[PDB]
Design a protein around this motif. Structure first.
Motif, short mmCIF file in Angstrom:
data_model
loop_
_atom_site.label_atom_id
_atom_site.label_comp_id
_atom_site.label_asym_id
_atom_site.label_seq_id
_atom_site.Cartn_x
_atom_site.Cartn_y
_atom_site.Cartn_z
N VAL A 88 8.08 -18.39 7.73
CA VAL A 88 6.85 -18.08 8.46
C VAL A 88 7.03 -18.23 9.97
N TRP A 89 7.69 -19.29 10.41
CA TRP A 89 7.92 -19.47 11.84
C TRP A 89 8.72 -18.28 12.39
N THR A 117 0.84 -1.20 0.00
CA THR A 117 0.00 0.00 0.00
C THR A 117 0.87 1.24 0.00
N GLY A 118 2.06 1.12 0.59
CA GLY A 118 2.97 2.25 0.66
C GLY A 118 3.03 2.82 2.06
N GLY A 119 2.03 2.53 2.88
CA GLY A 119 2.01 3.06 4.24
C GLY A 119 2.16 2.03 5.35
N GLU A 120 2.64 0.83 5.04
CA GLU A 120 2.78 -0.20 6.07
C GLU A 120 3.80 0.15 7.13
N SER A 121 3.46 -0.14 8.38
CA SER A 121 4.38 0.09 9.48
C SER A 121 5.32 -1.12 9.43
N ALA A 122 6.42 -1.06 10.16
CA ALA A 122 7.37 -2.17 10.16
C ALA A 122 6.70 -3.49 10.51
N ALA A 123 5.87 -3.47 11.55
CA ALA A 123 5.17 -4.69 11.96
C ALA A 123 4.17 -5.17 10.90
N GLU A 124 3.50 -4.23 10.25
CA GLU A 124 2.54 -4.60 9.21
C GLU A 124 3.26 -5.20 8.00
N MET A 125 4.50 -4.77 7.77
CA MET A 125 5.28 -5.32 6.66
C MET A 125 5.56 -6.79 6.95
N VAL A 126 6.07 -7.07 8.14
CA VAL A 126 6.37 -8.44 8.53
C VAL A 126 5.09 -9.27 8.48
N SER A 127 4.02 -8.72 9.04
CA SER A 127 2.74 -9.39 9.07
C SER A 127 2.24 -9.66 7.65
N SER A 128 2.51 -8.73 6.74
CA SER A 128 2.11 -8.87 5.35
C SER A 128 2.86 -10.02 4.67
N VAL A 129 4.15 -10.14 4.96
CA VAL A 129 4.94 -11.21 4.37
C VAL A 129 4.45 -12.54 4.92
N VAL A 130 4.07 -12.54 6.19
CA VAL A 130 3.55 -13.76 6.80
C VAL A 130 2.27 -14.17 6.07
N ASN A 131 1.37 -13.21 5.85
CA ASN A 131 0.13 -13.50 5.16
C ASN A 131 0.39 -14.01 3.74
N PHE A 154 3.21 -15.37 2.42
CA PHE A 154 3.86 -16.68 2.43
C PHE A 154 2.87 -17.78 2.80
N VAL A 155 1.96 -17.48 3.72
CA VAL A 155 0.97 -18.46 4.14
C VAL A 155 0.06 -18.78 2.95
N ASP A 156 -0.30 -17.75 2.19
CA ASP A 156 -1.16 -17.94 1.03
C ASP A 156 -0.41 -18.81 0.00
N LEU A 157 0.86 -18.48 -0.24
CA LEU A 157 1.67 -19.23 -1.19
C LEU A 157 1.84 -20.70 -0.80
N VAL A 158 1.99 -20.96 0.49
CA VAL A 158 2.14 -22.34 0.95
C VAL A 158 0.90 -23.12 0.54
N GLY A 159 -0.27 -22.51 0.72
CA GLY A 159 -1.51 -23.16 0.35
C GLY A 159 -1.56 -23.41 -1.15
N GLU A 160 -1.17 -22.41 -1.94
CA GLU A 160 -1.18 -22.55 -3.39
C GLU A 160 -0.15 -23.57 -3.85
N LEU A 161 0.99 -23.61 -3.17
CA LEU A 161 2.04 -24.55 -3.54
C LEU A 161 1.59 -25.99 -3.32
N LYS A 162 0.82 -26.22 -2.26
CA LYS A 162 0.31 -27.57 -1.98
C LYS A 162 -0.63 -28.00 -3.11
#
Lengths: 149, 149, 144, 146
Positions: free
Chosen positions: D138-139, D85-99, D101-109
């Motif tokens: 993710v961990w 979005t351009g306005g992510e806080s540091a924590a939201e950035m990490v949280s975004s990557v978690v989201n 990667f979690v989505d990708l894991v599902g798609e990869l399966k």
């Protein structure tokens, strides 16, 4: 173009190409099948030797090309021209070392003959390359025989 | 002790040991005899490939040992069991590339069959190693075919 | 005229586009020069990756915000994406055209940076420019 | 119903990683706060891996006879991953990557299952390697957020 004195150099060179192509697999054979208390030492030694074999194959064949010949490049032709015999499959660790000693000793003799023929054809570059392989084998021979004492 | 199904795996493995022993020399053949404007590129490519061949030979043979079998370790036995033919000696640069494409394509098919047999013998470790060789060949196949287009 | 940051982001957008365009050529090239070009294009997209980061961080270093989305890159880039059907020669020719365009844009951007007394920005742009001019000679020679 | 062309599923990930290469750069550039240096470095590590996934995935597509997605327009069109979005806080950035990667894991399966069904084990294996790496990331990223 080429004369018989010149072609004999490529022929003698290919004889060693064939020998080393055979040895590349023979040394792998020993690398794989050796066993006993010296397994790790010999497993390693044989890898060192087939790695050198791989190097001789390429240098010898390319020297053939460098003087206008065609290198032996099939297993069929290698088996046909090689003076070196393949492993039996049942060699003990000591017999493997002893076998390499026998083969290297045979090659040293053949290398001396080939060098003389190369020298007579005024192909010193070929003689020199063969000499380098020979010197290395003589050193390996001392070490392998010491191991067997 | 290892079962019969687990021992048929060693046979299929040795079939590839034989194929790669043949290819190690075939790729050297192409490495040495290729010519034309793409000489340097292909001379280099073929070295890359025989270097990989050398790696397959050792891994395949040692996997055979790891499951209780004896690896094919002579040129005579390799020629006997290999499905891969040796070079003719007169291949043009394009025919060399095309030949590697044909051989790799054949191996991919054989690797799929071997993996299925390994999987059925619950020998996943063998299947996985074969799969790694297969994946690499499929990538090489795309590149070599692109070169020929 | 524009903000130095604006001109910088224009190149950020161009290189973001080129990173993928060069991958396109890296992947789809074929013919007798496949291996040579496959390798050349990797060398170039690797450099692209470096330009993207340096340009964007220079933007940050002068107080701006770097273009950092594909949508904004496509919007601001002057570089067009690959067609998908370029022949090997057309790929090389395309890179020549793009680099030539960038050299022109880099000269303009440097002049603007110099006028804003932002020599550090001008210098970084100059380093990219010098590299492109060298690549241009080589790629054109290949086509001769 | 579901997508069964292996090359199509592969290109879906090519698109995702092309998007992520720039998204991770976005976070690499805009992150701030006390963990700036740690995250600035982490995001570089991740986009560097992204660059690697892009090439391996696209070349696997080529290896099986398809054509890789190779334009930003097509990537945006096929990617399931959204741009920053351009306005992510540091924590939201990490949280975004978690989201993501979690989505990708599902798609990869899902993609692996399709590849396996087409007897394309080589493709499944490559996808599995990316998946395993994401699960590990993710961990770590979730631990950081705890």
């Amino acid at each position: 173009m080429k004369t018989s004195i010149q072609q004999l150099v490529a022929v003698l060179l290919n004889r060693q190409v064939a020998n080393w192509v055979v040895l590349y697999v023979k040394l792998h054979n020993f690398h794989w099948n050796v066993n006993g208390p010296n397994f790790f030492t010999l497993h390693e030694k044989f890898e060192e030797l087939y790695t050198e074999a791989s190097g001789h194959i390429d240098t010898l064949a390319e020297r053939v090309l460098s003087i206008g010949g065609s290198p032996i490049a099939t297993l069929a032709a290698s088996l046909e021209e090689a003076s070196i015999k393949e492993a039996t499959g049942g060699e003990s660790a000591a017999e493997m070392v002893s076998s390499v000693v026998n083969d290297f000793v045979d090659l040293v003799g053949e290398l001396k003959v080939a060098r003389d023929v190369a020298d007579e054809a005024d192909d010193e570059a070929t003689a020199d390359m063969l000499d380098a392989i020979e010197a290395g084998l003589e050193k390996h021979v001392w070490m392998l025989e010491a191991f067997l004492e």
